[PDB]
Amino acid sequence: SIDLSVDTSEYNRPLIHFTPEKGWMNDPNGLFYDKTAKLWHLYFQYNPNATAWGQPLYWGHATSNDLVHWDEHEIAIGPEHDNEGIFSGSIVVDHNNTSGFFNSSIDPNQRIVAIYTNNIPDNQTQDIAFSLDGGYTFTKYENNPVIDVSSNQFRDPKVFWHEDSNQWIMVVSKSQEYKIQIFGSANLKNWVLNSNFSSGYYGNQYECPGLIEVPIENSDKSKWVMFLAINPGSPLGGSINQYFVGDFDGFQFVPDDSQTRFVDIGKDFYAFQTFSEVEHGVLGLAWASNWQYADQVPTNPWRSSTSLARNYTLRYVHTNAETKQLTLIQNPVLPDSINVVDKLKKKNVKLTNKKPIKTNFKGSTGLFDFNITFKVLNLNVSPGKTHFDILINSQELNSSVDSIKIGFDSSQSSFYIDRHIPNVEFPRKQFFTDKLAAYLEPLDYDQDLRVFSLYGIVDKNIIELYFNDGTVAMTNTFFMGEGKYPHDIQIVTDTEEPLFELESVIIRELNK
Amino acid sequence: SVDTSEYNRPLIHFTPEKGWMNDPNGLFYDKTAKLWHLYFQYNPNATAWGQPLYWGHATSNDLVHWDEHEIAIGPEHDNEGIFSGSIVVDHNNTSGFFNSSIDPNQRIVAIYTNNIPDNQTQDIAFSLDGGYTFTKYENNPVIDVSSNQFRDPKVFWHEDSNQWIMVVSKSQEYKIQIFGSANLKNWVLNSNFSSGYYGNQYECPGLIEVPIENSDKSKWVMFLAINPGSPLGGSINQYFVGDFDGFQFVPDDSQTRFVDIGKDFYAFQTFSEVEHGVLGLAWASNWQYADQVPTNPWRSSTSLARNYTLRYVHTNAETKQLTLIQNPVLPDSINVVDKLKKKNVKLTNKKPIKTNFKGSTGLFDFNITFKVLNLNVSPGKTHFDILINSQELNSSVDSIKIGFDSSQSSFYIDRHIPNVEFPRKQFFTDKLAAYLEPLDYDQDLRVFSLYGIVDKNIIELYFNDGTVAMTNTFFMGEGKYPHDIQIVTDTEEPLFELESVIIRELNK
Ligand SMILES: *[C@@H]1O[C@H](CO)[C@@H](O)[C@H](O)[C@H]1NC(C)=O
Ligand SMILES: *[C@@H]1O[C@H](CO)[C@@H](O)[C@H](O)[C@H]1NC(C)=O
Ligand SMILES: *[C@@H]1O[C@H](CO)[C@@H](O)[C@H](O)[C@H]1NC(C)=O
Ligand SMILES: *[C@@H]1O[C@H](CO)[C@@H](O)[C@H](O)[C@H]1NC(C)=O
Ligand SMILES: *[C@@H]1O[C@H](CO)[C@@H](O)[C@H](O)[C@H]1NC(C)=O
Ligand SMILES: *[C@@H]1O[C@H](CO)[C@@H](O)[C@H](O)[C@H]1NC(C)=O
Ligand SMILES: *[C@@H]1O[C@H](CO)[C@@H](O)[C@H](O)[C@H]1NC(C)=O
Ligand SMILES: *[C@@H]1O[C@H](CO)[C@@H](O)[C@H](O)[C@H]1NC(C)=O
DSSP states (O other): OOOTTOOOHHHHSOSSSOOOSSEEEEEEEEEEEETTTTEEEEEEEEESSSSSOOSSOEEEEEEESSSSSOEEOSOSBOOSSTTOOEEEEEEEEOTTOSSOOOOSOSOTTSOEEEEEEEEETTEEEEEEEEESSSSSSOEEOTTOOSEEEEESSOEEEEEEEETTTTEEEEEEEEGGGTEEEEEEESSSSSOEEEEEEOOBOOSSOEEEEEEEEEEBSSSSOEEEEEEEEEOSOOTTSSOEEEEEEEEEOSSOEEESOOBOEESBOSSSOEEEEEOBSOSSSOEEEEEOSOTTTTTTSSOSSEEOOBOOOEEEEEEEEOSSTTOOEEEEEEEEOOOSOSEEEEEEEEEEEEEOSSSOEEOOOSSOOSOEEEEEEEEEOOOOOOSOTTSOEEEEEEOOTTSOOOEEEEEEETTTTEEEEEOOOTTOOOTTTTSOOOEEOOBOOOSBOSSSSOEEEEEEEEOSSEEEEEETTTTEEEEEEOOOSTTOOEEEEEEEOOOSSOSEEEEEEEEEEEEO | OOOOHHHHSOSSSOOOSSEEEEEEEEEEEETTTTEEEEEEEEESSSSSOOSSOEEEEEEESSSSSOEEOSOSBOOSSTTOOEEEEEEEEOTTOSSOOOOSOSOTTSOEEEEEEEEETTEEEEEEEEESSSSSSOEEOTTOOSBOOSOSSOEEEEEEEETTTTEEEEEEEEGGGTEEEEEEESSSSSOEEEEEEOOBOOSSOEEEEEEEEEEBSSSSOEEEEEEEEEOSOOTTSSOEEEEEEEEEOSSOEEESOOBOEESBOSSSOEEEEEOBSOSSSEEEEEEOSOTTTTTTSSOSSEEOOBOOOEEEEEEEEOSSSSOOEEEEEEEEOOOSOSEEEEEEEEEEEEOOTTSOEEOOOSSOOSOEEEEEEEEEOSOOOOSOTTSOEEEEEEOOTTSOOOEEEEEEETTTTEEEEEOOOTTOOOTTTTSOOOEEOOBOOOSBOSSSSOEEEEEEEEOSSEEEEEETTTTEEEEEEOOOSTTOOEEEEEEEOOOSSOSEEEEEEEEEEEEO
């Protein structure tokens, strides 16, 4: 509640994370790649009419050729009445016209079908629609719904083609029953229930399931990963994403273990979905906010951004000194051929209270990234201090400087963030957490020493952290006072002698 | 030698006189002596975790008044220590230590981890004087797996398989290992269990039969502690609900649930020889900052003892799930200095509930049942909070905050206190948790209940009738302690109706 027609974009609006022009966004929808058009598609839960979640609810639509530059198009799908809306869903490409929508020169791999939840008063169903113009306008299928279970709580279909069972698989969730329901079809129109899956952190409801085959990093081997979103049960706060690793025959998913693991342990990574028609590799992004405060954050005339797209692999990594576990790794996309305004490189800098690392750029795009590999040296240091931190500071406007903090404590072998900013108040802080997480284990040892790596990227209201080589991800929005945005970056310590040796430091000012 | 006890030291939570404490150990009840026993990981020589490590020892007759006794078990060398373990009562002398008039149910055996350089083993010891001095068994260790990471035995007698069961953890393998014995001396590996939130290591497992609230039915619960993997921060406790035949534990589902979603509830252990009901307590701190908190000449307290039951409760509007319920003990016959009762209070900014007690024991409790009324209120405000304030010393007042937001149907805490700094804050979280679902509906309205107890550095919250617990330590500036309690709102008209409010100043 700050409105007027005050537009915060200048200091708030991310530059390379997608953002709608005006209005409210949540779950990403119908993510696919168009092969012939060489084009990435982003759809999303969209309310254009308010800056919060809205009763007549649509699929918004953007395209990109590189996953950092977006064009906003007209609404893709709308509801029959203001009475409710077009909830989350996915898209597939029906190359072989198994659904029977094909004028005759509707290009294969441009033969586009959307599967989504249709939200009516007292009823949620799975409906389908098809696009003949490349995914810009859609036609709803005469005989919708394609699945109706007489339920008020049954949503978020993610479908994909699965060979060697020779069927379309739908992964949808019966939310309050805590079941991911797996359906089959040779048709996209007629569906059959194959199995029910229930595990991990229950919270309040199951939402937005995913099921996809992810490669193991070195081998030609892979595993199937079940993605599941829960809200409002998150042990961390409101909303969160989790995953399971195992097998899949087209009928039931069978996990390798019964352990719970989260995709991202930041506060702001929810409703994760994967992209369709990606050849070699797995790609996906999420809604980059948390349901407990997402509609109160001081941005206008929009709310919400998407996260960066991420490349998903599986890697055996040490969860403790002795073990190793096949772990979900994620790393950010970035075209490289993004603008580097200018940068700062240094090598094996032995960091002290006497020589901090400071950016000296002149001018500031809101957007920066920092990439560090470091060694923990043998040195006795008093329990506190604050074992090395990287500080992201604003311009010095209004006789104060706003800053967020990202550090690593070597006694706790843990990374941490502190997104607390003074004098910024908004409804439902209390749930806006400030201090977070992240225990790791060395990325490597080089001479019995302990080596870690860090990659972070700050847009304008959003910071994404990738610890080791994407072993764990931490996404968080941060706010900063009216007019202020990130201007420079320091790396500091209270230690007199060097405890941390930064083998490599690269700090970059980036631009659109 | 500044002593912070006057404003920091809990009054009814156990605390060692001097030195450092962590995991609670060898919890048992003595039937003939009518006495509760508390042992613990103890380093007397420093105010942090210490190389020569002992089992400390306290007794109580009511679980809120404690006598500190001499060390119960010590290690052979300063080189290491006596790690976590449990106690059982060998009524029928299956171990063969019995002069002849060593009373049954006073026939006491301690099972513990012996930490040596490069070696952790399970050893046993017996007490003939009522659990005050111990003798180590000649042929220790009772179990040795040639491991550096193998600890925290919890043992109990299990009929209908007719054996002693040991629940111990092979920490870095992520296995709770289940052993059997007719002996307490000779053990056989029966099964391995691996589930829930892995984190870094498995620690302090538990296995016990817990009643379902109304029926004569019950379930078996596996307790498991992990650190430093906790999704919330450092250390945390989790549980599983299922069956047990004496050989393998088989859970009803494969879901992860935590025992307490505060930052400071770890190494939970259950009491032995409790007839009807299940009782236990935990180390009331978090491993990432536990040795840096501003208290002297001690660090760490135990939590209150809790009564543990299982109840079918709504996790969402539609469902219900057999959930672990916990509630605090408190003798009732604790000193109530004075109190404040109110009924049917329709809260507004113009009707703030305030304590007016005169004088302050550090210790208070508050018990509230409330309705969320039908009323449009602007998104913010701060839907009703309860504020715990200090004395007004040094021209400032320190306070922690416990509230409930009706739009988010969630309770929350904010333990942030200005100007108090100590090593490794960064991990000291401040704002926490707690989504619930109504305890009841009375006329399509939504009813919740809250019970909280503040000692002097520790606050324990129990939402609904113990559906979820939230334990957190809080700190407050030099000299300051809780003095009074307010319940406030920013709403002009009443959004919350407090059906019942009881605020009490308590004492030893
Ligand atoms: C919602 O937004 C769309 C803009 O595309 C508009 O056509 C419609 O009238 C709006 N509805 C309401 C109820 O504001
Ligand atoms: C599907 O179409 C592709 C060519 O577009 C072809 O290679 C494949 O064999 C077809 N499968 C079926 C079942 O028609
Ligand atoms: C799957 O879930 C539904 C949910 O109500 C249930 O009725 C059905 O029996 C389940 N089917 C299988 C095959 O487990
Ligand atoms: C993702 O990474 C894999 C190899 O790790 C590679 O084949 C692919 O090019 C990447 N995909 C994208 C879109 O960058
Ligand atoms: C960080 O830099 C290293 C160069 O040492 C490179 O391998 C890597 O691609 C960078 N990581 C990310 C996530 O951009
Ligand atoms: C249990 O665990 C140990 C690993 O520590 C392993 O050697 C053994 O095979 C397992 N035994 C059973 C019966 O599962
Ligand atoms: C704990 O609760 C049980 C009911 O499950 C009751 O019978 C028992 O006496 C209680 N014990 C204590 C110490 O409060
Ligand atoms: C709180 O108060 C209610 C009476 O309204 C009572 O039933 C309950 O025993 C109390 N709970 C605790 C934990 O003191």
